[PDB]
Amino acid sequence: PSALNFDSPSSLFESLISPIKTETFFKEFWEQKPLLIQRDDPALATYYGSLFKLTDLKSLCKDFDQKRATIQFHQPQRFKDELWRIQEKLECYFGSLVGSNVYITPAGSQGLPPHYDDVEVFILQLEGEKHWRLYHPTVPLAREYSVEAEERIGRPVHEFMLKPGDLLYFPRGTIHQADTPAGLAHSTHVTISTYQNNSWGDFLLDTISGLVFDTAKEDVELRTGIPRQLLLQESTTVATRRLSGFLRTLADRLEGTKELLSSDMKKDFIMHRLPPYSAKLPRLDSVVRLQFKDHIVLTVLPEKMVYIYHSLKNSRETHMMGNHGLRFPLSHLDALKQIWNSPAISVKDLKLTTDEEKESLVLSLWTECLIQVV
Amino acid sequence: PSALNFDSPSSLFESLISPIKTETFFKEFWEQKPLLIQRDDPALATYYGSLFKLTDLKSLCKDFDQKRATIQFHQPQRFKDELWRIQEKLECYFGSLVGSNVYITPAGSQGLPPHYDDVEVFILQLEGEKHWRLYHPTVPLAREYSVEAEERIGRPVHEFMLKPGDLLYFPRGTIHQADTPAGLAHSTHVTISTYQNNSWGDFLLDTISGLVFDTAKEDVELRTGIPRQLLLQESTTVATRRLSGFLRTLADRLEGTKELLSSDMKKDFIMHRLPPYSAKLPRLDSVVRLQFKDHIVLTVLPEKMVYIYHSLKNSRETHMMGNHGLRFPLSHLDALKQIWNSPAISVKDLKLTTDEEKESLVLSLWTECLIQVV
Amino acid sequence: PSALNFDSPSSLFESLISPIKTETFFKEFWEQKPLLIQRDDPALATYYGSLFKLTDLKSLCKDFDQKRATIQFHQPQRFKDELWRIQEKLECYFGSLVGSNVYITPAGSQGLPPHYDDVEVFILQLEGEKHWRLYHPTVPLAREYSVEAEERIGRPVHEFMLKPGDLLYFPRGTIHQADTPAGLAHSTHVTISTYQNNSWGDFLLDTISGLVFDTAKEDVELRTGIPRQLLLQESTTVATRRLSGFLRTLADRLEGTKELLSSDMKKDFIMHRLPPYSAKLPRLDSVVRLQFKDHIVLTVLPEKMVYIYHSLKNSRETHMMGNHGLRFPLSHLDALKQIWNSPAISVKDLKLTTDEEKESLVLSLWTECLIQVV
Ligand SMILES: O=C(O)CNC(=O)C(=O)O
Ligand SMILES: O=C(O)CNC(=O)C(=O)O
Ligand SMILES: O=C(O)CNC(=O)C(=O)O
Ligand SMILES: [Mn+2]
Ligand SMILES: [Mn+2]
Ligand SMILES: [Mn+2]
Ligand code: NI
Ligand code: NI
Ligand code: NI
Ligand code: NI
Ligand code: NI
Ligand code: NI
Ligand code: NI
Ligand code: NI
Ligand code: NI
Ligand code: NI
Ligand code: NI
Ligand code: NI
Ligand code: NI
Ligand code: NI
Ligand code: NI
Ligand code: NI
Ligand code: NI
Ligand code: NI
């Protein structure tokens, strides 16, 4: 029950927030308020204690910051197998990049000053205890990180002591501050984070181009040039009124829209996500199924070609630090769309001229591990 | 009258289309239909003949293509002074990049096959005659270049013979084809082009980010995360309906909007445009005026800083081939906005703490040639 | 008399400080106190006015700083011919690098705050007037630059107004401050500087190695190893007492020393100095003379070789920005020393085995312009 179940992205998330049900988490907590899961599970406490240890910092004897009396180890999933296993599963579950930072603070020391972050967090207490104080957001669902002065935050809303095996979730914009109680024991926790720049605002700006391109093919007013020197000649009343009309027309056009195109979001997720955790040949008469659907991008790029790219060979060692696929002719697009939008498809049923072309396509997909033979 | 008047961008354009009045050009021709200016000016004919010559191709003895029986010399303004002088003036006038291509076709040869272009063109006949046929657009105000089959274009709408000193204007999407009459004389013309990707559609996508950023600061619904796996899990009815609502809200928000921010259009124009054609010290008690306003970008970039960049030191030799400024603290933003939005301003009237800071600002602007002392 | 006489380094310096005699300058002023030369020479005023102009900054339309309300143009000798001519002559005269900076301050503005510099300066007033205040040094003959607070400098010792054609000399460590009088005219001056890190202390550290190398060849105590871990195991009484003895022995050894070797000073001067200002073949029976003696370094470097390097082909454009010669066998050293230490020498008189070797040596020197045929 408490033990992390790596069977599916769903079973991992369900086990991570145990005993809380996912229906409860999404209805009551997600992007709304903090969730504190205090447990009494010595097995889970031993498990959390193995995710990262103070000794792992000395097994790295750049990858960490020294903010006052706090060591921050960036992206431990680069070296810690279990965290790679957890974070990869969460990326499948959220459809968003999932990074992590380890925070180590000696006994009796204050951590970072009061602040809020731009990410949804899952804090796992690994070693020792840490005293937390949570305050009401000044900016609910903040899009940026910010420190907040103690005289602007008010009194804590939640205050508690985290111990190994405990989990704390809180949405972006939650003002917080933590300190290690005086004593012998230092504190070690991992902050697993997701949902950075994954808002409706980000999604609208990511899909707007495809919508304008489609509309302009049918509407000559969108194809019409702007007035001379508009880019240079404080703004004008004329431009805002025309743009209001265009946005209203696009809103009406969306009602009939069946497909939205991602300009960069889908592509950036696929290129940056973690690779899958690592420890039959198709024929004309076989049935195929596309596998790892949420790990693939199918785009048309310039004469144009169909491009397929996946995350199956992504570098684990570069994940979140910030510093693979195929190409086919446009004629293959109908057959590739048949594979994408089908639970299972016969190779002979593909929309290509020769039976050889059908076989070559599926053989290409199989060499990348993008298809499974049923 | 006919002679090109380089006094201002306005006087250059007025003289270029002589005897046609700019009021007539904008009301009747611009982005609507072709304008043929056939003249009887031997002085202008000699002038056009000096803009580019077949001999100039041999004075370049990559910079040109060999499309069938037509030589196309790219961007002659890189070496021809008079064309640099003309094109620079047109960039000020249009607020859009202005490139050119020279077309040389021997007597008796067909040019390029029927097609339409994605730019507004001004064709100047420099040497010999060329036989033109213009057809009705299949795609009015086309956003892309395309060849069109002779059996899809119909009969010509306009047919004429261009000779030196003649000008031909036509909007993007105009299907056309030209051939050099049989005889002794080859044809040389220059196609001055502008308004590539300068439509209302391009402008809407260029300003939309600033609008969403501003709205999301006040609207928590734009700050709210998308549903899990939306980027991956064919599109849904839910997303299109939410996006329709957001676009309608943004349209209402635009009515009250006084300023629009350019994400890239203004910046790309400034970085790529031609430099100005080339052949008093400010004090605390002096009056200053910002000069070359349409050659400057003032942006805030990340801690944030105010960045100023101009086109006054742009490379002439790289113009349109595709292969300078200052930095100030955020405190200077109010004073820089005072300079931008003022016909003339006293240095002592600037919103800065010390009189020295006021003097340093204007001295910085003067070293870049961005200010004039009144 | 007042006009700059470029006949020799001596005649240039004599004319630069006119009407002051060089005997007076060295006895009374050099490294002792300021010298103000206020003149009434309209010809010299016109001459100074041509050395650098506010317009020369716009003829550069990195090479300058913008310190508050003062523009500082670094190393104008890179582009200004007359300043190259002056500074090159001064490097011959001083045997020290001679750089310059132009200072431009608008009317009514304060210059840099009170400070002292680490160089000997010759300030030439080129355009307008500047109000100077000189104070008593806090650090006489300072080795570093430093600002000094107004409450630590006392009252001015000297106060004057510089006008075009005026010269001001002051030693390193002289606290000073200048401001442009209120009015219409900006101020332009050039600060010609020399004697940076050219002290007895610098010279002692530059020659000490050669002295220790020579002494250790004869003294086994200098060849003896230090005690184990001396470099690591706060200092000890034993080391200081031994070092006192060594320094006393070296002092006694210097009395008999006839030649001092430069570890880097001579080499750095030759590599960085300005090239000479630009607008017979030797035979066995000819008499030769080494020319540009103060532009050449003769060193033995590793099997060892004799290396000759000169400054005759130094880059003018890189002077003071901070970002040529021959090689011969060790057997040639006696003959090269004969050329160095002789006002004129017969080629046949050189200490080399064959007459051909004598001819080859002098032919090598002639190709670099290091020898003149008498
Ligand atoms: O432990 C700390 O000092 C601070 N940790 C965080 O801000 C966090 O996990 O977001
Ligand atoms: O001259 C030609 O053959 C074709 N010229 C053009 O297509 C043009 O100027 O757009
Ligand atoms: O002119 C000024 O403001 C200051 N000039 C100097 O410090 C100088 O020449 O050393
Ligand atoms: Mn128990
Ligand atoms: Mn006539
Ligand atoms: Mn006089
Ligand atoms: Ni860091
Ligand atoms: Ni935090
Ligand atoms: Ni506490
Ligand atoms: Ni990247
Ligand atoms: Ni591969
Ligand atoms: Ni194929
Ligand atoms: Ni080309
Ligand atoms: Ni064309
Ligand atoms: Ni014809
Ligand atoms: Ni570019
Ligand atoms: Ni510049
Ligand atoms: Ni300033
Ligand atoms: Ni500098
Ligand atoms: Ni100084
Ligand atoms: Ni004064
Ligand atoms: Ni150097
Ligand atoms: Ni040489
Ligand atoms: Ni020899």
**Which residues, other chains included, contact C191 with Cβ-Cβ below 8 Å and sequence gap of 6+?**
C100, C101, C102, C103, C121, C122, C123
Q: Which of B102, B109, B112, B179 to mutate to test the pocket of ligand 2 (most atoms within 8 A of CB)?
A: B112
CA pair distance C24, C105, nearest whole angstrom: 33
CA pair distance A124, A162, nearest whole angstrom: 9
Cα-Cα-Cα-Cα torsion B124, B125, B130, B136, nearest 10 degrees, comes to: 20
Q: What b-and-e string marks burial along B221-235, b requiring 16 or more CB atoms within 10 Å of the CB?
A: ebbbbbebebbbeee
For chain B, the domain total comes to 3
Q: Which amino acid is at B224?
A: T
Residues C344 and C312 in one domain: yes
CA pair distance A141, A117, nearest whole angstrom: 9
Tokens 């300021």 -> residue: C34
Residues C23 and C58 in one domain: yes
- Asked whether the beta carbons of C16 and C167 are under 8 A apart, the reply is yes
Residues B113 and B255 in one domain: no
Q: Say whether the peptide bond before residue A19 is cis (omega within 30 degrees of 0).
A: yes
- The token pair at B171 is 């909007």
Quick one: B295 exposed, middle or buried, by C-beta within 10 A (0-12, 13-18, 19+)?
buried
Three-class HEC string of C71-129:
EEEECHHHCCHHHHHHHHHHHHHHCCCCEEEEEEECCCCECCCCEECCCEEEEEEEECC
Choose the final residue of a domain: A264, A289, A315.
A264
Interface with B, mutate which of C53, C68, C112, C188 (most B CBs under 10 A): C68
CA pair distance A262, B235, nearest whole angstrom: 11
Smallest CA-to-CA distance from B177 within B238, B103, B246 is with B103
**Containing structural domain, residue A237:** 200-264
Write out residues 188-217 of B within 8 Å (CB-CB) of A: 195, 198-205, 207-209, 212-213, 215-216
Smallest CA-to-CA distance from C250 within C224, C225, C213, C223 is with C213
Q: Which residues of A touch B120 (CB under 8 A)?
A: 225
C264 marked among binding-site residues: no
CA pair distance B220, A171, nearest whole angstrom: 13
- The token pair at C240 is 């200081």
**Which residues, other chains included, contact B99 with Cβ-Cβ below 8 Å and sequence gap of 6+?**
B75, B77, B87, B192, B193, B194, B319, B320
Smallest CA-to-CA distance from C36 within C125, C127, C147 is with C125
Q: Is the CB of C206 under 6 A from ligand 3?
A: no
Quick one: A151 exposed, middle or buried, by C-beta within 10 A (0-12, 13-18, 19+)?
exposed
Query: Quick one: which ligand is closest to A322's CA?
Result: 10
Interface with A, mutate which of B213, B226, B261 (most A CBs under 10 A): B226
Tokens 């001004």 -> residue: B122
CA pair distance A260, B239, nearest whole angstrom: 9
**Do you know the residue count of chain C?**
374
Chains touching chain B at 3 or more Cβ pairs under 8 angstroms? A, C
CA pair distance B135, B120, nearest whole angstrom: 16
Helices (H), C289-328: none
- Asked whether the beta carbons of A46 and A4 are under 8 A apart, the reply is no
Chains C/A: 3 or more C-beta pairs closer than 8 A? no
Three-class HEC string of chain B:
CCCCCCCCHHHHHHHHCCCCCHHHHHHHHCCCCCEEECCCCHHHHHHHHHHCCHHHHCCCCCCEEEECCEEEEECHHHCCHHHHHHHHHHHHHHCCCCEEEEEEECCCCECCCCEECCCEEEEEEEECCEEEEEECCCCCCCCCCEECCCCCCCCCCEEEEECCCCEEEECCCCEEEEECCCCCCCEEEEEEEECCCCEHHHHHHHHHHHHHHHHHHHCHHHHCECCCCCCCCCCCHHHHHHHHHHHHHHHHHHHHCCCCCCCCHHHHHHHHCCCCCCCCCCCCCCEEEECCHHHEEEEEECCCEEEEEECCCCCCCCCCCCCCEEEEEHHHHHHHHHHHCCCCEEHHHCCCCCHHHHHHHHHHHHHCCCEEEC
- Asked whether the beta carbons of A147 and A173 are under 8 A apart, the reply is no
* Ligand 2 first shell, C-beta below 6 A: B 70, 103, 105, 111-112, 117, 123, 178, 191
Residues A152 and A41 in one domain: yes
Q: What is the CA radius of gyration of chain C?
A: 25
Tokens 């809103």 -> residue: A251
Within 10 angstroms of residue A369's Cβ, the number of other Cβ atoms is 15
Smallest CA-to-CA distance from C129 within C180, C72, C176 is with C180
What CATH number does the domain containing C178 carry? Answer: 2.60.120.650
How far, CA to CA in Å, does C254 sit from each of C107, C208, C223, C250? 57, 10, 19, 6
Nearest CA in chain A to B212: A201
Q: Where do the DSSP E strands lie in A128-238?
A: 130-135, 146-147, 158-162, 167-170, 175-179, 187-194
- The token pair at A140 is 């609910």
What CATH number does the domain containing A232 carry? Answer: 1.10.10.1500
What CATH number does the domain containing B320 carry? Answer: 3.90.930.40
Q: Which amino acid is at A304?
A: K
The residues whose Cβ lies within 5 A of ligand 13, an ion, are B 65
- The token pair at A204 is 């609208």
Choose the final residue of a domain: B155, B176, B199.
B199
Q: What is the DSSP letter of A237?
A: H
Smallest CA-to-CA distance from A12 within A97, A84, A102 is with A84
Residues B319 and B344 in one domain: yes
Q: Say whether the peptide bond before residue C34 is cis (omega within 30 degrees of 0).
A: no
Residue A229 C-alpha, separation from nearest chain B C-alpha, in angstroms? 4
Q: Does B257 touch chain A (CB under 8 A)?
A: yes
- The token pair at B68 is 């069938």
Residues A22 and A169 in one domain: yes
Smallest CA-to-CA distance from A104 within A53, A47, A35, A45 is with A53
CA pair distance A225, B204, nearest whole angstrom: 12
Please, what is the Cα angle at B265 between B262 and B267, to 5 degrees? Answer: 85
Ligand 20 centroid, distance to C186 Cα (angstroms): 18
- Asked whether the beta carbons of B170 and B118 are under 8 A apart, the reply is no
Q: Is the dihedral of CA A319, A322, A323, A324 positive or negative?
A: positive
Smallest CA-to-CA distance from B134 within B148, B124, B119, B145 is with B148
Q: How far is CA A295 from the centre of its chain?
A: 12
How many helices, marked H, and strands, marked E, lie in chain C? 11, 18
- The token pair at B309 is 């960049």
How far, CA to CA in Å, does C227 sit from each of C233, C235, C248? 10, 12, 21
- Nearest-CA residue for ligand 2 atom 8 is B191
Residues A210 and A174 in one domain: no
Q: What pairing do the DSSP bridges indicate for beta strands A175-179 and A158-162?
A: unpaired
Crossing angle (nearest 10°) for helices C9-16 and C81-94:
110
CA pair distance B12, B89, nearest whole angstrom: 7
- The token pair at B97 is 């990049």
CA pair distance C40, C32, nearest whole angstrom: 26
Within 10 angstroms of residue C280's Cβ, the number of other Cβ atoms is 8
Residue B281 C-alpha, separation from nearest chain C C-alpha, in angstroms? 6
Residues B90 and B172 in one domain: yes
Q: Where do the DSSP E strands lie in chain C?
A: 35-37, 64-67, 70-74, 99-105, 115-116, 120-127, 130-135, 146-147, 158-162, 167-170, 175-179, 187-194, 287-290, 296-301, 305-310, 325-329, 345-346, 371-373
Experimental method: X-ray
Q: Say whether the peptide bond before residue C343 is cis (omega within 30 degrees of 0).
A: no
Smallest CA-to-CA distance from B354 within C109, A360, A45 is with C109
Residue B370 C-alpha, separation from nearest chain C C-alpha, in angstroms? 12
Q: Is the CB of C179 under 6 A from ligand 3?
A: no
Q: How far apart are the first and last CA of chain B?
A: 33
Q: Is the CB of C290 under 6 A from ligand 3?
A: no
Q: Is the CB of A114 under 6 A from ligand 1?
A: no
Residues C193 and C212 in one domain: no
CA pair distance C223, C42, nearest whole angstrom: 66
Q: Which residues of B touch C68 (CB under 8 A)?
A: 356, 359-360
- The token pair at B10 is 């306005």
Overall resolution, Å: 2.6
- Asked whether the beta carbons of B173 and B139 are under 8 A apart, the reply is yes
Residues A127 and A17 in one domain: yes
CA pair distance A226, A243, nearest whole angstrom: 11
Helices (H), C182-332: 200-218, 220-223, 237-256, 265-272
CA pair distance C92, B251, nearest whole angstrom: 75
**Which residues, other chains included, contact A371 with Cβ-Cβ below 8 Å and sequence gap of 6+?**
A282, A288, A289, A290, A291, A339, A362, A365
Q: What b-and-e string marks burial along C191-209, b requiring 16 or more CB atoms within 10 Å of the CB?
A: bbbbbbebeeeeeeebbee
Smallest CA-to-CA distance from C249 within C283, C282, C221, C281 is with C221
Choose the final residue of a domain: A231, A264, A297.
A264
Q: What is the CA radius of gyration of chain A?
A: 25
Crossing angle (nearest 10°) for helices A42-51 and A81-94:
100
Q: What is the DSSP letter of A347?
A: G
Residues A325 and A360 in one domain: yes
Within 10 angstroms of residue A219's Cβ, the number of other Cβ atoms is 17
Ligand 1 centroid, distance to A178 Cα (angstroms): 6
Residues C260 and C172 in one domain: no
- The token pair at C188 is 């332009």
CA pair distance A128, A185, nearest whole angstrom: 6
Interface with C, mutate which of B278, B280, B281, B291 (most C CBs under 10 A): B281
